[PDB]
Amino acid sequence: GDRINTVRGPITISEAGFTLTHEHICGSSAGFLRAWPEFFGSRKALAEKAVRGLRRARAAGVRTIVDVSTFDLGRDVSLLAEVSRAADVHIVAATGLWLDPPLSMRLRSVEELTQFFLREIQYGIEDTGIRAGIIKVATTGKVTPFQELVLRAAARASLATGVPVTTHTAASQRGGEQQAAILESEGLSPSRVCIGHSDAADDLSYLTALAARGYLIGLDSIPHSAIRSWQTRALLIKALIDQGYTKQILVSNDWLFGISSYVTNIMDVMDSGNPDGMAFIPLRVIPFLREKGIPQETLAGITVTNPARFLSPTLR
Amino acid sequence: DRINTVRGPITISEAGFTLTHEHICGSSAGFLRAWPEFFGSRKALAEKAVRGLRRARAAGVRTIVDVSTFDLGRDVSLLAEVSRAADVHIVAATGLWLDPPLSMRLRSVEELTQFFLREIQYGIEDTGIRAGIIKVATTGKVTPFQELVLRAAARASLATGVPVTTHTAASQRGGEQQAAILESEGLSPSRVCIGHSDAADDLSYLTALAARGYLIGLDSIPHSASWQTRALLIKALIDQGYTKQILVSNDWLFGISSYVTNIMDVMDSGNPDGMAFIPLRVIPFLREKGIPQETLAGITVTNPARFLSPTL
Numbered sequence: 001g002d003r004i005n006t007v008r009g010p011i012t013i014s015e016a017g018f019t020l021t022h023e024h025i026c027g028s029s030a031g032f033l034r035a036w037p038e039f040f041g042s043r044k045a046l047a048e049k050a051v052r053g054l055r056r057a058r059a060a061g062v063r064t065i066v067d068v069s070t071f072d073l074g075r076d077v078s079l080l081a082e083v084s085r086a087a088d089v090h091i092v093a094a095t096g097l098w099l100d101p102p103l104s105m106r107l108r109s110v111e112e113l114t115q116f117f118l119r120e121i122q123y124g125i126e127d128t129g130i131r132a133g134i135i136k137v138a139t140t141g142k143v144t145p146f147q148e149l150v151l152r153a154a155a156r157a158s159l160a161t162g163v164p165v166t167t168h169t170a171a172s173q174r175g176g177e178q179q180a181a182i183l184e185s186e187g188l189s190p191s192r193v194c195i196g197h198s199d200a201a202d203d204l205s206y207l208t209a210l211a212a213r214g215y216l217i218g219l220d221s222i223p224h225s226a227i228r229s230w231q232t233r234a235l236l237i238k239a240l241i242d243q244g245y246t247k248q249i250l251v252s253n254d255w256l257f258g259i260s261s262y263v264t265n266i267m268d269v270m271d272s273g274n275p276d277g278m279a280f281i282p283l284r285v286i287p288f289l290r291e292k293g294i295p296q297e298t299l300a301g302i303t304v305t306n307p308a309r310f311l312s313p314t315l316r
Numbered sequence: 317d318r319i320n321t322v323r324g325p326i327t328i329s330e331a332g333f334t335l336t337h338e339h340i341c342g343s344s345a346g347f348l349r350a351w352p353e354f355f356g357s358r359k360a361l362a363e364k365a366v367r368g369l370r371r372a373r374a375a376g377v378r379t380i381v382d383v384s385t386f387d388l389g390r391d392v393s394l395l396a397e398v399s400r401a402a403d404v405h406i407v408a409a410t411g412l413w414l415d416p417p418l419s420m421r422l423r424s425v426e427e428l429t430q431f432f433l434r435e436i437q438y439g440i441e442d443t444g445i446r447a448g449i450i451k452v453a454t455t456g457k458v459t460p461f462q463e464l465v466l467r468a469a470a471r472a473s474l475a476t477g478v479p480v481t482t483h484t485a486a487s488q489r490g491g492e493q494q495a496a497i498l499e500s501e502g503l504s505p506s507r508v509c510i511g512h513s514d515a516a517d518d519l520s521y522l523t524a525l526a527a528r529g530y531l532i533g534l535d536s537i538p539h540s541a542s543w544q545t546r547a548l549l550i551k552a553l554i555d556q557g558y559t560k561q562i563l564v565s566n567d568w569l570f571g572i573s574s575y576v577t578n579i580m581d582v583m584d585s586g587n588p589d590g591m592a593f594i595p596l597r598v599i600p601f602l603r604e605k606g607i608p609q610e611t612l613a614g615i616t617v618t619n620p621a622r623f624l625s626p627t628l
């Protein structure tokens with residue numbers, strides 16, 4: 001407690017400011033940006049596009065992003081440090097595993113995965129020293145055996161360091177419920193867990209029941225509807241406020257500036273559907289919520305206070 | 317006239333005794349740099365590799381071909397460090413093995429062709445260290461994505477002259493499906509090694525491929541360590557007239573993360589010779605069976621040189 005690790009070193013919690021808690025510089029695969037940078041035009045072209053997009057978001061009020069790219073999403077932390085410095089936006093890096101682990105991860109025990117997540121939080125990522133400030137885990141269906149090991153290793157690393165856990169779900173399958181059961185079996189407090197992609201939920205009662213248990217609800221992919229409207233997703237934010245669960249809400253774009261882990265040219269399709277990029281939350285969602293009558297203090301709580309509480313390393 | 321190595325180009329006569337299917341590390345993309353303590357440390361793995369390569373050099377090896385691809389975790393800076401310190405030539409590979417990430421799996425044949433060309437003609441990552449071989453792995457009857465990898469490999473080989481080497485299940489005669497695809501792209505069989513052929517129960521499968529001009533990779537002899545029975549496949553192909561089609565190797569590794577933990581210790585206990593197994597055990601065994609030294613030198617020196625020299 002008192003400081004959050006970022007790609008340019010520790011910051012105090014008051015420095016984080018407006019924080020987008022689920023974003024990516026680049027959605028890729030381990031080793032890929034280094035082995036084939038011209039897939040993105042060039043490494044310099046991707047960095048320049050990410051710096052302009054982050055400066056765009058900064059001019060709309062954002063001061064920090066949490067890049068929830070794991071090892072297997074190709075998360076290159078040296079790129080994050082470079083674009084963080086050039087944009088003057090803090091970036092929190094992640095450990096954990098997403099949905100494309102290679103064999104060298106897939107064959108590991110829970111104890112081995114715990115030591116890997118442990119290494120990225122406590123020592124540093126690769127040979128850069130940059131330490132992770134969050135653990136990202138993805139699951140599908142009812143949670144596969146390997147995904148259950150990842151959740152348990154994540155809980156273990158969280159309990160030893162205080163850094164929170166954030167998840168990838170299918171809300172339409174109520175996937176947070178299985179995640180929550182596994183993480184609680186490990187002794188992890190719900191207040192150290194964000195159940196992500198909860199904006200895609202059709203069932204408000206699924207979200208209300210997780211919030212009432214203390215989970216953070218990641219309404220984190222609002223503009224993916226702009227490519228069910230985005231205003232319908234944003235109304236889940238108002239619904240949880242009106243139910244008294246403002247403190248449980250985290251809002252983000254889930255944007256990216258380059259994508260190789262999908263069909264070629266998807267980034268162009270996405271950018272034409274959401275030209276605001278990571279500024280979509282502050283330029284479109286926040287004004288929409290204001291016009292629906294949500295007061296300033298509540299919107300500042302969601303965008304500043306809740307991420308600060310969530311990211312502050314806590315064992316209390 | 318020259319072959320790319322991790323220390324730059326060398327002339328064909330420099331390659332000498334060549335093991336054409338080996339690995340410094342069997343891992344996954346990004347993994348050695350993200351989690352080097354899995355191997356004790358990066359330094360410990362490099363030290364183990366240098367000890368093993370120096371042992372192979374003392375036994376007569378002068379070059380190895382490291383057929384680790386991107387998705388086997390190939391770390392061509394590690395290869396360069398241990399090539400220099402062992403003073404053993406290492407040829408690096410492009411291509412794809414059996415664990416491509418989404419960023420590779422979702423690519424077209426044209427995109428994959430550009431990636432393999434990038435690693436042969438420009439360099440691997442930002443090291444400028446060019447690949448001298450293309451490695452391709454397939455499973456059953458060849459999946460749709462594996463077929464794209466073979467076609468891109470054939471295209472890259474036709475544009476550069478560098479050869480193609482494969483991973484099969486010899487028990488499934490996988491080289492027949494591989495060869496049909498490669499030939500549909502116009503690739504000469506003389507620029508293809510069908511690997512893991514030592515595991516075959518069917519000599520007919522190997523002789524038919526050799527009769528078409530394929531190189532036969534009898535590359536995993538010490539993994540069976542009977543290894544004697546696998547080595548007699550070398551004699552069988554010699555006796556049928558196919559000496560010039562034979563390539564032999566150990567398929568050894570100095571670290572392994574792409575498998576259950578501690579497999580490396582099991583392997584090192586069964587084969588303490590490591591990469592020196594071929595020169596110290598297989599070559600003398602074949603000589604005792606009456607194969608002339610000149611034939612063994614052709615298999616370990618001339619065939620490798622003919623295969624690696626870029627052609628067309």
Ligand SMILES: C[As](C)(=O)[O-]
Pocket residue numbers: 027073168254
């Ligand atoms: C990289 As994603 C679509 O799971 O946020």
Ligand SMILES: C[As](C)(=O)[O-]
Pocket residue numbers: 342388483567
């Ligand atoms: C890395 As292998 C066992 O296919 O030679």
Ligand SMILES: [Zn+2]
Pocket residue numbers: 138168169197
């Ligand atoms: Zn996700």
Ligand SMILES: [Zn+2]
Pocket residue numbers: 022023024068254
């Ligand atoms: Zn995401």
Ligand SMILES: [Zn+2]
Pocket residue numbers: 453483484512
């Ligand atoms: Zn193989």
Ligand SMILES: [Zn+2]
Pocket residue numbers: 337338339383567
């Ligand atoms: Zn191999």
